[PDB]
Amino acid sequence: SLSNKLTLDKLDVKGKRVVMRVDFNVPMKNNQITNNQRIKAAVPSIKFCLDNGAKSVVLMSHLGRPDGVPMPDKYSLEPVAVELKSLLGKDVLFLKDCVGPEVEKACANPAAGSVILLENLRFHVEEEGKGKKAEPAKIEAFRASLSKLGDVYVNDAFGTAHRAHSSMVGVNLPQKAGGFLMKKELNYFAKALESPERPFLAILGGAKVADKIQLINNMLDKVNEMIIGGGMAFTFLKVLNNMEIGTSLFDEEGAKIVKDLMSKAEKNGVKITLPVDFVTADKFDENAKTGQATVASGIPAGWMGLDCGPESSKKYAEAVTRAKQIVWNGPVGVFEWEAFARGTKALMDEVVKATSRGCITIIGGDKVSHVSTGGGASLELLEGKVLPGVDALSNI
């Protein structure tokens, strides 16, 4: 909801220093970024600021969960600065901290047009307001320091909008505006949820049932169809079909409530699509020996299902084909491992094809309508919850 919040499009930034919270919390391997989507997504906001004469843009974010200990050897934002420099065609000055005298001096009056990226906010216990306990006078000093780094604050950190952390809710500046990414994300989910195109399909995958209960319930009140996929589905199939599932994931708490989810699906007229066949593995390994199973065959003892199989992909494809809107959150298989990526890659293929014929296609965690930068924050929007990062924006 941004009708009564200040937004970047109406913020005057000419000759002003902008401190901007972003979600640059990007997947990483051996200090190489493996998905730069979250960095690219902040670009419109940054460039609007530069193009309208900001004196500076100070970007701040966390990365991973270093729990309030400075971990520059493992969870440094420095690779992001390098990546952002390409994206912008502008020098990015990387500061090895995010608060204190040195950072304050670097941000006091930078050369016109400067883009500055601070180090991981979570190197300070005062950001989360807890660590692996915070002191109010320390949290206050942390926040007072971030508040010096610009004249105006912008929150473009949609992916972190569910976290009531100091950089998200604690910044004390007269004007705190929602960025273009904040707006775009909220608009898309608001349209999808309040004015859906129909049939409305949700594809939900993931490992467990018990932590997805509220999500599933809230989705059942809005959708026409739901795919339940990923390791979750083994819980449903053991309960509903007494499928023999081997060593695959089994949610003992979620098993107890599958009856109730299906009851809600039924009274709402929601067609549930579960997988019907599987790619099995002999261990939880990328280079495990692999096989095949169906619901009817069962999964042989000692083996686990790590991807859906080809007939499940035809069934998932039936539901995609009928859809005019799709919201997909969670994997249907362990696609980080190529042997177990076919179900996900096939489903992505159908979803891309649906976008080509006019289907609204929303993915979370240009061949689709909207690739969300929010995993958890979007999961929170889908369960009907408030976003502290949005609430804390200044009102008009």
From Swiss-Prot:
GO terms under cellular component: cytosol; extracellular exosome; extracellular space; membrane; membrane raft; mitochondrial matrix
Chain sites annotated for binding (2R)-3-phosphoglycerate: V22, D23, F24, N25, Q37, R38, S61, H62, G64, R65, L121, R122, H162, R163
Taxonomy, superkingdom: Eukaryota
Phosphotyrosine: modified positions: Y75, Y188
Assigned keywords, A-Z: Acetylation, ATP-binding, Cytoplasm, Disease variant, Glycolysis, Hereditary hemolytic anemia, Hydroxylation, Kinase, Magnesium, Metal-binding, Mitochondrion, Nucleotide-binding, Phosphoprotein, Transferase
Tissue expression: Mainly expressed in spermatogonia. Localized on the principle piece in the sperm (at protein level). Expression significantly decreased in the testis of elderly men.
PTM note: Phosphorylated at Ser-195 by MAPK1/ERK2 under hypoxic conditions, which promotes its mitochondrial targeting.
InterPro entries cross-referenced by the UniProt entry: Phosphoglycerate_kinase, Phosphoglycerate_kinase_CS, Phosphoglycerate_kinase_N, Phosphoglycerate_kinase_sf
Location of this chain's protein in the cell: Cytoplasm, Cytosol; Mitochondrion matrix
Metabolic or biological pathway: Carbohydrate degradation; glycolysis; pyruvate from D-glyceraldehyde 3-phosphate: step 2/5
UniProt record similarity statement: Belongs to the phosphoglycerate kinase family.
Function of the molecule: Catalyzes one of the two ATP producing reactions in the glycolytic pathway via the reversible conversion of 1,3-diphosphoglycerate to 3-phosphoglycerate. Both L- and D- forms of purine and pyrimidine nucleotides can be used as substrates, but the activity is much lower on pyrimidines. In addition to its role as a glycolytic enzyme, it seems that PGK1 acts as a polymerase alpha cofactor protein (primer recognition protein).
Protein name: Phosphoglycerate kinase 1
Organism this protein belongs to: Homo sapiens
Lineage: Eukaryota, Metazoa, Chordata, Craniata, Vertebrata
